[PDB]
Amino acid sequence: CSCSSLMDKECVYFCHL
């Protein structure tokens, strides 16, 4: 699981780092 911009913490919580 990964997002476009790991920077955007919102996008992180998603996959949960």
Q: What is the DSSP letter of 16?
A: T
Evaluate the CA torsion angle 3, 7, 10, 15 in order and state its sign. Answer: positive
Rounded distance between C-alpha atoms, residue 15 and residue 8, angstroms: 12
Q: What is the largest CA-CA distance in the chain?
A: 15
Rounded distance between C-alpha atoms, residue 10 and residue 8, angstroms: 5
